[PDB]
Amino acid sequence: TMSLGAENSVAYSNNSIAIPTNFTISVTTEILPVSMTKTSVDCTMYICGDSTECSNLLLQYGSFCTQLNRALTGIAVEQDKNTQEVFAQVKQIYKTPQIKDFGGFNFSQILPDPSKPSKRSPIEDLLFNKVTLADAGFIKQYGDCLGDIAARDLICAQKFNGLTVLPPLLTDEMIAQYTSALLAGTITSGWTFGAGPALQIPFPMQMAYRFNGIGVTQNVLYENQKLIANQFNSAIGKIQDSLSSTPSALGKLQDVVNQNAQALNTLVKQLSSNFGAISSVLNDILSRLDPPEAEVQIDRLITGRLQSLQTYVTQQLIRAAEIRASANLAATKMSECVLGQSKRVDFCGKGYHLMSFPQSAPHGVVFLHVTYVPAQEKNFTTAPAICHDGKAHFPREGVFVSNGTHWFVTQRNFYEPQI
Amino acid sequence: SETKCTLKSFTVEKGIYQTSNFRVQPTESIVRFPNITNLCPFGEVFNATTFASVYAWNRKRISNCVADYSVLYNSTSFSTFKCYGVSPTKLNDLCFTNVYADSFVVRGDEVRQIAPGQTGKIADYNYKLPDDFTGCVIAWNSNNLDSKVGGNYNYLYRLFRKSNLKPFERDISTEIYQAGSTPCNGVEGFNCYFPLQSYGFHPTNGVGYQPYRVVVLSFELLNAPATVCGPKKSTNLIKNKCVNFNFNGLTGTGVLTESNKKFLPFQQFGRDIADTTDAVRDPQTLEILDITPCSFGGVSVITPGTNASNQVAVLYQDVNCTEVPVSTGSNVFQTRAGCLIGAEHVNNSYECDIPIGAGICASYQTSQSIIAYTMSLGAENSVAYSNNSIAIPTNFTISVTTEILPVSMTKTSVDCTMYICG
Amino acid sequence: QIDRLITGRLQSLQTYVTQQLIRAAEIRASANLAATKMSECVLGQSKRVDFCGKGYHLMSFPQSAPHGVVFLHVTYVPAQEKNFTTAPAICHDGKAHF
Amino acid sequence: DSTECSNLLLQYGSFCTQLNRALTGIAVEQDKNTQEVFAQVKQIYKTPQ
Amino acid sequence: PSALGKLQDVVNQNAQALNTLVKQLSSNFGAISSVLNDILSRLDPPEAEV
Ligand SMILES: CCCCC/C=C/C/C=C/CCCCCCCC(=O)O
Ligand SMILES: *[C@@H]1O[C@H](CO)[C@@H](O)[C@H](O)[C@H]1NC(C)=O
Ligand SMILES: *[C@@H]1O[C@H](CO)[C@@H](O)[C@H](O)[C@H]1NC(C)=O
Ligand SMILES: *[C@@H]1O[C@H](CO)[C@@H](O)[C@H](O)[C@H]1NC(C)=O
Ligand SMILES: *[C@@H]1O[C@H](CO)[C@@H](O)[C@H](O)[C@H]1NC(C)=O
Ligand SMILES: *[C@@H]1O[C@H](CO)[C@@H](O)[C@H](O)[C@H]1NC(C)=O
Ligand SMILES: *[C@@H]1O[C@H](CO)[C@@H](O)[C@H](O)[C@H]1NC(C)=O
Ligand SMILES: *[C@@H]1O[C@H](CO)[C@@H](O)[C@H](O)[C@H]1NC(C)=O
Ligand SMILES: *[C@@H]1O[C@H](CO)[C@@H](O)[C@H](O)[C@H]1NC(C)=O
Ligand SMILES: *[C@@H]1O[C@H](CO)[C@@H](O)[C@H](O)[C@H]1NC(C)=O
Ligand SMILES: *[C@@H]1O[C@H](CO)[C@@H](O)[C@H](O)[C@H]1NC(C)=O
Ligand SMILES: *[C@@H]1O[C@H](CO)[C@@H](O)[C@H](O)[C@H]1NC(C)=O
């Protein structure tokens, strides 16, 4: 019997309270698809295969062919606009500043590294390496497939039958530039450049504004600036370690790639079936039978192959709907987690949210979310409302607690003994 | 014009407009058959001095011959000719694998029973054909040879059997057949019958009671090697060009190239996962050749509107800007998306107008011409980071924008009967 | 012959209905987004970033249209600025003031 | 359960495999839906007196 | 009574789809009958293939 989890309990006491003495800064990872592969189909090459007797009988189905091609064109344009909406929010490229002291904060690993091609971050480099792509570009020449007959590579097989893959408009370097501009803007000007021109501000000031956002006073930072900066450095180290240690991290992107490849390959394999005809080869039928008797078999084959193409197109449309929903969610999370700080619960990370960073990926994006989680706690005694002189007095911002002889007021997300 | 025909309109807007593919046409035709010189034994097979009885029918093997059936035109006249797995007009262009010939004599009104799916005396107890039969059936009258004034009784047929025969099986037993429950133990009597019976042919009997001679041919057409071929002259072998070929009756078009795979002695050609022929063994020089399609594809056309101009640019997805692998005027440019012909490359970067691919866009501008360029992401900028320096705005602006969202779509209903039958 | 025609025409009708279903799903997603936009920008002031306008949000007005709706978002944008000098706090009598 | 049929269905077993893959995907999706709605917390808290 | 409608609609939709799938077996798609046993009883293989 599967275990739901470790059974636990909370002791309800109406004259007691627990307030967190300490806290942690934790960073997690999140993976979302953005776009799929774009494809187009030639009817005549897939159905008739360079036969003149065929394709003189396909003049009665060219209309269905036009409909299929229209649907595929719509899908391709949709993929392009999905990438635009996710990554092209800002048209002002913000150059990465000369790496300055940020108070211990270390964006060296998320910022581009000049001493390598394409000027991309080491974490992005690892993410690019982890996911495999079965395309290797689109430059396959006729001589390349003609010479390599012995190696039955699948790409030549699906390209000899009218199935081709079109390249996306935005190259990888362009997307890296977009992400670099986003990171530079968000590390210099804070949240300002989302609404109006960017205004310069120290990083300690911006993240002290973040603490004031979550409801924790600035003094918690100010008395412990170096400790908290070291804490964030430790969190980003934990993220690099977690990404490097476990190969099985990026699954959804790989699943998208594998699904597209499998769909094309099964379309290729379905040419071996005869749909009640004497054979699955047009050449054999045309070699053995006269035209009035060959027309029947050719018609059966044409009907079957059109049915296969229609099934492929329908599946592609449904998958496009799913990816559209994911892309819209990615755009919303980008806007609400890197252009501002969200009060929503469990949206930009588990816990009280601080900020987020994007990293590029093939067919998707990876979000590094920086959250707040309280550490160990200590129980205390309280009163429903501290009445001093007959008029119920209430604290403005904290909660009144006592050790047993003295009364102090303190807030909720962190322990702050104050009078 | 191709995109005009695809859109079924005489006006075309701007775009990229995927065309069909790249195609190449054959220029030559070749024929390769094995060298046979001897004519095929028609005179022995059709034209024997004696023929067998239907129950003890005869089988003969035919190999290493040329099937020119035009030599029978002045010799024979046929009353029945029907083929099953092949069209009679394609017999001059084929080669046949495992030919056999069967021959016997029957009545006139029993020739209809030599066909698949039949029932009757001959089909049940004498001669049976398979349901999936491939071959031809021939018959002709023989009253002037197999009839005598007194009566000819040499031909025999079977009358009684306990069970029906399986296809292409023969029995020549002479055991006594029992009809009643009384055991026979030999000695034909009241309920015991001799199974075989004799035809009686006279020169003055009816048309359905006259003898007929039947020959049945069976074979397999394409798979496996063949040694019997039609009367077609052979040609020379052409390699590394798109030609029309005919290898042992198999027709197609493609490019032939030497191969490394080795066949077993009982194999002639091979197939791939799609069940298409990709290799073949030459009948004359025993060598292995591969077959590759001629058309490969990847073409698209870039144009402004037809109202504006009639200039176009064409994109080939997979070419290192040379002659197109199986029309360069002045401008050739190379991109990661492919070779672009008909545009002028420019160093300046503008806003994207018509998306080409791999970070290249096109536009129409000033004498007007089509240009291609790397798309501009936007205006380069930077922000100074200075922590001891903070900046706060002293004016603001109040602005209004517009947002457009669809809500509903049209409601429609369909009547099946009026749309389909009407 | 009549059976061939019947089968073809049924196939055409089924294809039409499938495309209609997919389009209806997309339109329903748009309609839900529009309903939330109304409820959260016209009946209230939203704190979400880039949801009810390009900048700090003030309000929004609805306008009708055939098969749709048009939203007019009134937004705050900061104009020209000036640089100054800042420090984390001020130590006046030894105790940091923030 | 006719043997003459399903000897002629070897030409369409591929389409059958495709259909079955789609249905299996739907089933796994339903299980994940229920888990994503109801399994937010892993510490099972017991109701007090 | 008319409070929990959407859940019941889901259940009804699934059941009705399965029942319609069962009922569609009564149609003959241009054949002489919708029963395989009937066709196999009256006709030989080369004619029953169609
Ligand atoms: C010796 C018998 C034939 C052996 C070789 C034949 C192989 C395959 C048969 C092809 C058909 C042509 C041969 C029979 C003549 C047809 C009758 C006619 O001409 O009307
Ligand atoms: C707490 O509960 C106890 C009994 O359980 C009761 O006597 C007391 O008045 C309560 N106090 C408050 C502040 O709820
Ligand atoms: C709070 O937790 C961090 C995390 O390890 C630790 O380094 C720090 O000492 C803790 N502070 C206190 C006061 O316990
Ligand atoms: C932290 O920053 C220093 C530069 O001061 C750099 O050398 C080091 O590699 C960084 N550590 C990271 C990015 O983990
Ligand atoms: C509670 O805090 C005060 C500090 O003002 C301390 O003097 C007192 O002893 C504490 N109570 C206990 C029980 O330790
Ligand atoms: C056919 O003739 C060629 C010479 O023209 C010879 O090399 C070959 O072995 C011959 N083979 C057959 C099939 O007769
Ligand atoms: C054809 O056959 C007839 C009768 O046997 C004969 O007279 C005639 O010469 C033949 N023709 C040829 C061209 O051999
Ligand atoms: C059979 O062959 C003989 C020669 O042996 C010839 O005289 C006769 O006409 C032939 N018969 C037919 C009908 O071919
Ligand atoms: C084959 O032999 C068996 C055993 O004698 C017999 O019962 C059967 O009928 C035979 N087959 C035919 C077609 O007669
Ligand atoms: C063209 O040829 C060069 C040199 O072989 C090669 O680097 C390049 O990838 C080829 N294709 C394109 C798209 O330029
Ligand atoms: C800011 O950083 C510089 C070093 O880059 C340092 O000299 C200065 O004192 C710091 N001041 C503030 C306001 O953080
Ligand atoms: C800036 O603010 C002043 C004071 O309200 C105003 O008079 C001036 O018009 C503002 N600037 C613009 C461009 O309106």
Residue numbers in the entry:
A (entry chain A): 692 to 1110
B (entry chain C): 297 to 622, 637 to 676, 685 to 740
C (entry chain C): 988 to 1085
D (entry chain B): 741 to 789
E (entry chain B): 938 to 987
Sentences from the paper on this structure:
Another related CoV, BANAL-20-52, demonstrated the highest S protein identity to SARS-CoV-2 (98.4% AA identity). To obtain structural insight into the S proteins of CX1 and BANAL-20-52, we determined the cryo-EM structures of these two S proteins at resolutions of 2.74 Å and 2.50 Å, respectively. For both S proteins, only a closed conformation was observed, with all three RBDs in the down state. Notably, in our BANAL-20-52 S structure, three free linoleic acid (LA) molecules are observed, which are embedded in hydrophobic pockets within the three RBDs. Comparison of the hydrophobic pocket surrounding the LA molecules reveals that Y365 in the previous structure blocks the gate of the pocket. The RMSD of CX1 and BANAL-20-52 protomers from the PT are 1.798 Å and 1.692 Å, respectively. Particularly, the opening angles between N-terminal domain (NTD) and RBD of CX1 and BANAL-20-52 protomers are smaller than that of D614G, indicating that NTD and RBD clamp adjacent RBD more tightly than D614G. The compact packing of S1 subunit suggests the preference of CX1 and BANAL-20-52 S proteins to adopting a closed conformation, consistent with the fact that only a closed conformation is observed in structural determination of the two S proteins. Comparison of CX1 and BANAL-20-52 to PT demonstrated a largely resembling RBD-RBD interaction, with S373 and F374 forming a hydrogen bond (H-bond) network with D405 and R408 of neighboring RBD, respectively. Notably, N370-glycan forms van der Waals (vdw) interactions with Q493 of the adjacent RBD, thus strengthening the RBD-RBD interaction and stabilizing the down state of RBDs.
